[PDB]
């Protein structure tokens, strides 16, 4: 469920 | 007392000594030594060391007096040096806190003269390298505090400090090479910079440094400079007093106003011993008449603006009067009394419009030269003391607390020459040599209910304002990933900025693991996930953070063995 | 050969606003006056008046470090115009590069300011190093100061007299 790079 | 420490963080900071060390390291050594011997003095539990940067608020004030030192010693080693020289709004700043501080306390006694016995005695170091002031809009040559103030109340004093704030400047002026010439001096050097002549104003000898020597120098100077006192203006009033017939008529002698004549100097306030709060009995007059009618009073000096009127006269003395004698700071005041050599008398002191019909006033007090002839003394009495002592002496002698109507009315007459806010004090001083009866309880000359209104509703929004800037202190710096606009997807976007504080987590997140460490950390999770043990991890490297203690490991472990 | 013919040349020039020739000449009119800015640059010649003929031009030819340094060159430093010229993101010179070049330390300051308020940590980094060179402190004997004044004088002319003609 992780879409992207985690800080942005 | 309480000790703040206003700290640039310019980049001119960022320059470095012959020692290979930066300006702004060697000022938090300078601190740490300091506050090393502030816990060498045994008043170290009374001192409360704060800490204020030049940086924008909420972010100006680091160390709230809440705070404890572990955070302090955090935020004052990890400062980093990224602000400008905004000297006037750092100072205004940390001069609004702590003028919002004396007044949510209240011992502000405004229209009520001023108690030397409320103090908050604070002094506030400023360390900067004496470099240009800088501003977003350019360079400033002069050192403009600023005039607006969102602080409500502070027009009641002309000056944003007050008489018991000392402010020091420290100068770093260390060389860039090693200086070849040896320094002989025995003492401090003033600086020549925009800071000094506030310093001067506000009762401060700012200090510029060249080597680590006189560097200590120069702070075991504001160790011993580390008292609590009364920051006084001081101006002769009346013609000079008569030179020593036992000296020759200097016809050398300068016409004009000597700096004993009109010095500002600091009287020490010594605490009682037994009790450790300092203890008074007459506030001094105010610099204008107390009216019940005004809506309004006038705004006060920061320091008392006094007039001593050198004329020699008897210090009368009666028993079982309670008076506040306090000792003065060596002065060319006090050089020139103890060079007269004259304990047997005294000069009178006396405050500028302190009577309805009299701009000098009646005498308040007097200046005189201790008995062994080391120091002055400041003795202060009620106000219009030549009148009310005999008063007093033919009461407690000849009437024996028992008044006839000519003195019941030659007191009433005192009394009305005597300003409003004294009868509380002189009630007190008069049920102590034992006529409470003397004065009745039914008259209190109090302020006008606009006034004290007024004041109330300013102590309710200075408990906002100092909950809010108790809610403010200690927020860090928060790092934006803001739009940037550019000219030469729809004009909202932003390239990210790296961040130090990420810390990614590439056990739960796959979008970490670069490329270059792919297959080992597939590896890595693989056996993480079919190892599968009672504790699973989400950190490879989870070593530690700043520091390994003895003692907590030793307190999370368990040790079963007394062996008594 | 003539540095007045050449100041009359390159004024001009700087009236028929082209700006790339003002500084041509103006370069060619130090190169003439000093062997080759081997020696500081009489200020007979570099006056105030054109330095801030070559100031204005270098604004509208959009070199913003260049007319910073320029600024530095002059007798009283134009720090408000140093800073107007270091507000604009539009810039032409290479900032990264004459920030050897600089030798004041307020400039210096303001640039740290500018580039921790907009997020340019590696050129903040560049700018943080150059003012903790040991060569320049605001506190020397002034000797050594106006000593690294002049050699940055010399290597900057000699690298705008390297990039112009």
Request: glycine share 4%.
């Amino acid at each position: 469920t992780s879409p992207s790079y985690s800080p942005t | 007392p309480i000790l703040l420490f206003l700290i640039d963080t310019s980049a001119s900071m960022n320059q470095r000594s012959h020692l290979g060390t930066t300006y702004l390291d060697t000022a938090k050594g300078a601190v740490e030594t300091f506050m090393k011997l502030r816990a060498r003095d045994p008043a170290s539990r009374g001192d409360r060391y704060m800490l204020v940067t030049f940086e924008e608020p909420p972010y100006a004030i680091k160390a709230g007096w809440k705070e404890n030192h572990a955070t302090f010693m955090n935020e004052l080693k990890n400062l980093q040096a990224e602000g400008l020289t905004t000297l006037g709004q750092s100072l205004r700043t940390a001069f609004d806190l702590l003028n919002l501080n004396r007044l949510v306390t209240g011992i502000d006694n405004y229209g009520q003269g001023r108690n030397p016995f409320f103090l908050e005695p604070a002094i506030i170091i400023t360390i900067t390298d004496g470099s240009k002031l800088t501003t977003t809009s350019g360079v400033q040559d002069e050192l403009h505090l600023p005039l607006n103030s969102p602080l409500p109340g502070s027009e009641l004093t002309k000056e944003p400090f007050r008489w018991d704030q000392r402010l020091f400047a420290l100068v770093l002026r260390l060389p860039g090479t090693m200086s070849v010439e040896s320094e002989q001096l025995t003492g401090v050097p003033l600086d020549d910079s925009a800071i000094t002549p506030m310093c001067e104003v506000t009762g401060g000898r700012s200090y510029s440094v060249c080597s680590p020597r006189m560097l200590n120098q120069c702070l075991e100077s504001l160790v011993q400079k580390v008292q609590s006192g009364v920051v006084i203006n001081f101006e002769k009033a009346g013609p000079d007093p008569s030179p020593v017939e036992d000296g020759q008529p200097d016809i050398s002698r300068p016409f004009g106003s000597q700096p004993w004549h009109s010095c500002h100097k600091l009287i020490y306030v010594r605490p009682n011993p037994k009790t450790g709060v300092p203890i008074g009995h007459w506030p001094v007059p105010e610099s204008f008449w107390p009216d019940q009618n005004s809506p309004t009073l006038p705004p006060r000096t920061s320091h008392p603006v006094v007039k001593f009127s050198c004329t020699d006269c008897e210090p009368m003395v009666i028993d079982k009067l309670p008076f506040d004698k306090y000792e003065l700071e060596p002065s060319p005041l006090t050089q020139f009394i103890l060079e007269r050599k004259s304990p047997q008398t005294c000069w009178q002191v006396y405050v500028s419009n302190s009577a309805k019909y009299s701009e000098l006033g009646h005498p308040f007090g007097y200046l005189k030269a201790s008995t062994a002839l080391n120091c002055v003394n400041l003795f202060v009495m009620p106000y219009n003391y030549p009148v009310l002592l005999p008063l007093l002496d033919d009461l407690f002698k000849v009437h024996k607390a028992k008044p006839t109507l000519k003195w019941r009315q030659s007191f009433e007459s005192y009394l009305k020459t005597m300003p409003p806010y004294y009868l509380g004090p002189l009630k007190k001083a008069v049920r102590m040599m034992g006529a409470p009866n003397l004065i009745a309880d039914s008259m209190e000359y109090g302020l006008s209910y606009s006034v004290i209104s007024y004041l109330k509703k300013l102590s309710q929004q200075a408990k906002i304002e100092s909950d809010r800037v108790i809610g403010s202190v200690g927020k860090k710096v928060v790092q934006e990933t803001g739009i940037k606009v550019r000219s030469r997807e729809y004009t909202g976007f932003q390239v990210a900025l790296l961040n130090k504080d990420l810390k990614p987590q590439t056990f739960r997140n796959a979008y970490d693991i670069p490329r270059r460490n792919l297959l080992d950390h597939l590896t890595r999770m693989r056996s993480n996930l079919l190892k599968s043990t009672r504790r699973f991890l989400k950190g490879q490297d989870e070593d530690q953070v700043h520091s390994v203690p003895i003692a907590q490991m030793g307190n999370y472990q368990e040790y079963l063995k007394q062996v008594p | 050969n003539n540095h007045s013919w050449l100041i009359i040349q390159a004024d001009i020039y700087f009236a028929t606003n082209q700006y790339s020739a003002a500084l041509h000449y103006y370069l060619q009119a130090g190169a003439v006056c000093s062997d080759f800015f081997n020696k500081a640059v009489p200020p007979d010649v570099y006056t105030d008046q054109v330095i801030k003929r070559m100031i204005k031009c270098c604004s509208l030819l959009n070199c913003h470090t260049q007319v910073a340094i320029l600024c530095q060159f002059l007798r009283e430093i134009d720090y408000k115009t140093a800073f107007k010229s270091l507000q604009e993101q539009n810039s032409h010179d290479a900032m990264d590069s004459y920030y050897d070049y600089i030798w004041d330390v307020t400039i210096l300051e303001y640039l740290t300011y500018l580039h921790h308020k907009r997020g340019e940590t590696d050129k903040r980094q560049i700018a943080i190093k150059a003012i903790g060179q040991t060569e320049l402190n605001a506190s020397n004997p002034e000797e050594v100061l106006q000593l690294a004044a002049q050699r940055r004088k010399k290597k900057f002319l000699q690298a705008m007299a390297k990039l112009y003609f």
